[PDB]
Amino acid sequence: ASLKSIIRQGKQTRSDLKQLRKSGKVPAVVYGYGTKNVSVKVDEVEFIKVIREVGRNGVIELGVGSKTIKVMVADYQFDPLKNQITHIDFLAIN
Amino acid sequence: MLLPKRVKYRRQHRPKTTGRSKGGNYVTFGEFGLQATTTSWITSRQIESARIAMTRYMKRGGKVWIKIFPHTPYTKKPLEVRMGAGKGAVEGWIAVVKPGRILFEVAGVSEEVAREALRLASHKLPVKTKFVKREEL
Amino acid sequence: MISKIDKNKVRLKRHARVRTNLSGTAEKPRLNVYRSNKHIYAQIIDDNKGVTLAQASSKDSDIATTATKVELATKVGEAIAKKAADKGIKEIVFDRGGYLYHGRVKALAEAARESGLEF
Amino acid sequence: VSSTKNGRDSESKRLGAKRADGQFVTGGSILYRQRGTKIYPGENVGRGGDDTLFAKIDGVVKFERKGRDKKQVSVYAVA
Amino acid sequence: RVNVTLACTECGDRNYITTKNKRNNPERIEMKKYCPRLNKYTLHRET
Amino acid sequence: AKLQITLTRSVIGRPETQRKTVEALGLKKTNSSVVVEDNPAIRGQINKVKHLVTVEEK
RNA sequence: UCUGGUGACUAUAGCAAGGAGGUCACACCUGUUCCCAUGCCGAACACAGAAGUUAAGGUCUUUAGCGACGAUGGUAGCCAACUUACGUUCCGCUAGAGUAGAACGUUGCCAGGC
RNA sequence: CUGGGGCGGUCGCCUCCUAAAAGGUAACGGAGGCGCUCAAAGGUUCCCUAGAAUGGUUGGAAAUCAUUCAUAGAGUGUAA
RNA sequence: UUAUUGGAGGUAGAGCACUGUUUGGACGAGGCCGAAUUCAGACAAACUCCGAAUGCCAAUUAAUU
């Protein structure tokens, strides 16, 4: 129940995302109770390996920058071709 | 032998073949299914030909689902006459399939048995397919 | 079990349909009349701006008097007539809200007609 | 010997808006040509026999909303 | 459906032509039109 | 500040719209120079034909 | 000040529930002599009453169960380029619809008695 | 007129799709109409507002209805 | 020709709220089984609760021409 994210910079061009999705990163967003709209990015293998313990629904400890919040999987855009995630949604469980 | 009971117009405009599948890209009835990876026109003759070749090797030991139905009829001028005389008569019914669209769906059978049955029905289809299972993550 | 229907509801609807091609405008203001099950109220309103400049009711202290339940209307019409006579007593559009023109309204309508209100 | 029976068609009636929004027009100028009440008439704007919107006062055109899902065109005397 | 010519009594001019159904109204039509020369709503009669 | 625009590519085989914009900038034939002041009005014109001219501060 | 009367704003203003009234005023109710009425019934409309009644409409409370309003973040398409041609590819531009989170039980104008 | 000519079929007007969110736009491209009717189907004033399923014509499972939904689902002299 | 702002309109997409088409569940309607309302999921040149990019009309001051 742990994950380290990285605050993404503002205004990302298509090429940027493509290059970011070409490696082992997947753009995500965080929003909910006692928090504002913050855009971050996590690892694909690190997310799938930490989503088999709690399963579909389960409280996780995301390291948004220099803080830890309890969030869950609200939505996730999946690509049928080449079975790869493209976007993840985190909602504050608090 | 699959065709609509009745249609408003017997002459269409030939469905466009571009982009990706609009919907129906996940198996929701069976456990395994055949997913297309190329774009082409699927006629009713081929659809029923692949279904007969699948049930024949399954020996009535499971349920089969068809997620495609010929909705657009196409015409064809016979005996190659001179061009310019109006549209011809209906020849058959087709169905456009884009990459990421599930074709068939099997259930209530061995996982290795469904992998061989789907492979036999893929030889009667004019599109590259791929064996997939119910996803849940 | 047949249910009853509101009388003010239907009336309002009809009134709105009659207010689609009729409205006050300084020179020609509209004389809206509200008839209840006890007294009757009337006031000259200017739709162009949206402010009243006249007021007359049957529940007024200088109008309240055990009448024949129809004479009050006549007085009401004559009451606002003099009030309207002070300033702006020329061409005016008479509004019958949503009720019929025959009845107490008629008496109130002709009350200003004999008062001098050119309408 | 195939035959045909679909070579008939009527003429096209130049419909649509005839005046832009914020443009100065003179009384009697047509503002819209339609088949029905696509756009209702606003202030200083009358409707013709063929549902044609025309101006009655010289001013600028103004396309606004009337209600919640209905449009309307009006004209103001202010130059 | 045939043509109808409303004749005048003073005018003497056919400045009013209308239509009607003989099978429907076989009787003569009598309406009150307006003859400019007389300048008065006179009673016209179909010939 | 100031800007120095230069026509490096020809206008032969280019859409009419682009041809009119190039003539509005002041450029005549190929390898033509023109000095103007930097502003949002000029920027837009240079952004329409950025693959036909070369801009450099000055 | 209060409830009313008449307006302006896109239902954030709707419907549903669960409540409390109130009798200033509304309503409800009582009739058919009176003007006036049903394609007939005084149901409605109209006039006269107005004894009783809040039961209903109803005004004020509570609830987001509907309905409507919907941040962001992504991408579908597309403009202009470049490449090989285009069931494209890549680089810039504008960035949807679906959906998440959420907001919503309306704000205003004028006249009177109060 | 014409994917050579002949044979056949068409030749004027009205509505939609093709038509690429202004307007306009072709083919022997795809669908339908008109060659009128109406003395009230006109003018003005005033007032009104389908389908489901239970006292069963052994039942057409829709008599001319009670009042729920109507929420307009209708209706408009005529094709869209 | 740009910049700035205002407006008219239903295409590409997407969607099933209407019209038609369709698949699995589900429909009863007769002394024995057959005309169905919902649940989920699809399709549309002559379907639309929605809806871009471009282009188009105009207005204003600026800036080049």
CATH number at residue B78: 3.90.1170.10
Contact A80 B136 (CB under 8 A): no
Strand blocks (E) in A8-83: 25-32, 35-43, 60-63, 69-79
Q: Is B87 left (phi over 0), alpha (psi -120 to 50) or beta?
A: beta
Cα gap A8→A20, rounded to integer Å: 11
The domain ranges of chain A are 4-92
A88: how many CB neighbours lie within 10 A of its CB? 22
Cα gap F58→B107, rounded to integer Å: 73
Is there a domain that residue B5 lies in? Answer: no
**Crossing angle between the packed helical segments B111-121 and B44-58, to the nearest 10 degrees:** 150
Considering only CA atoms, give the Rg of chain A: 13
Segment F35-43 long-range contacts (CB within 8 Å, at least 24 positions apart): F35/F2, F35/F3, F35/F4, F36/F2, F36/F3, F36/F5, F37/F1, F37/F2, F37/F3, F38/F1, F38/F2, F38/F3, F42/F3
Contact B135 A48 (CB under 8 A): no
Chain B: residue whose CA lies nearest to A81? B100
Please tell me which residue lies nearest to nucleotide I1, judged from CA to C1': F21
Element (H, E) at B97: strand B96-97
Cα gap A62→B115, rounded to integer Å: 40
- The residues of B whose Cβ lies within 8 A of any Cβ of A are 20-21, 25-26, 35, 37, 99-100, 135-137
Closest CB to A48 among B100, B136, B137: B137
Cα gap E34→E31, rounded to integer Å: 10
B85: how many CB neighbours lie within 10 A of its CB? 12
Size of interface A-B (CB pairs under 8 A): 15
Return the structure tokens found at F29: 């034939």
| C-alpha A89, offset from chain centre | 6
Q: Which residue has the tokens 């200088």?
A: C62
Return the structure tokens found at A3: 């994950």
Question: Is residue E42 helix, strand or coil?
Answer: coil
Q: By the 8 A CB rule, do C94 and C22 touch?
A: no
Host domain of residue B125: 23-137
Reported resolution in A? Answer: 2.9
Going by DSSP bridges, is the β-strand pair E2-7/E43-46 parallel, antiparallel, or unpaired? antiparallel
User: In chain A, which residues have their Cβ closer than 8 Å to the Cβ of B37?
Assistant: 81
B and D: touch, per 3+ CB pairs < 8 A? Answer: yes
B23: how many CB neighbours lie within 10 A of its CB? 7
Chain G: nucleotides below 7 Å from protein CB are 5-8, 10-11, 25-29, 35-36, 44-50, 57-58, 71-77, 80-82, 87-88, 90-93, 95, 99-101, 109-113
Instruction: To the nearest 10°, report the CA torsion of F36, F38, F41, F43.
Output: 100
User: In chain A, which residues have their Cβ closer than 8 Å to the Cβ of B135?
Assistant: 78, 83
Closest CA to D32 of D45, D11, D59: D45
Is there a domain that residue B9 lies in? Answer: no
**In Å, what is the CA distance from B67 to each residue of B52, B56, B57?**
16, 20, 20
State which approach was used to obtain the coordinates.
cryo-EM
Is there a domain that residue B2 lies in? Answer: no
Q: What are the DSSP calls for B20-75, one per residue?
A: S-SS--S--SSSEEEEE-S-EE--HHHHHHHHHHHHHHHTS-SEEEE-----EEEE
D7–B contact, CB cutoff 8 A: no
Please enumerate in sequence order all residues whose Cβ is within 8 A of that of F43, keeping only pairs 6 or more positions apart, or say none: none
Cα gap B125→B51, rounded to integer Å: 11
**Crossing angle between the packed helical segments C104-113 and C71-86, to the nearest 10 degrees:** 30
CATH dotted code for A4-92 = 2.40.240.10
- CA A34 to chain B, closest CA, distance in angstroms equals 28
> Can you list the alpha helix ranges (DSSP code H) found in A12-70?
14-22, 44-48
CATH dotted code for C21-110 = 3.30.420.100
Is there a domain that residue B61 lies in? Answer: yes
Return the structure tokens found at C84: 């309207």
Is there a domain that residue B10 lies in? Answer: no
